[PDB]
């Protein structure tokens, strides 16, 4: 998938995410 | 994908997301 | 999947997700 990012990600789901 | 971002972010789902 | 990215995620849940 090629991210390498630097915060927080979600993929692809049926759920929630939070980031405070 | 070649993201390599700095913050979250989905990748494209059926769910919610939130960052605070 | 080929993340190798700087913080933290989900990979497709059923459960919440927090980052304070």
């Not at 915060?7 to 759920?15: E, L």
Request: charged content about 5%.
């Amino acid at each position: 998938y090629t991210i390498y990012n630097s915060t927080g990600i979600q993929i692809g789901a049926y759920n929630y995410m939070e980031i405070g």
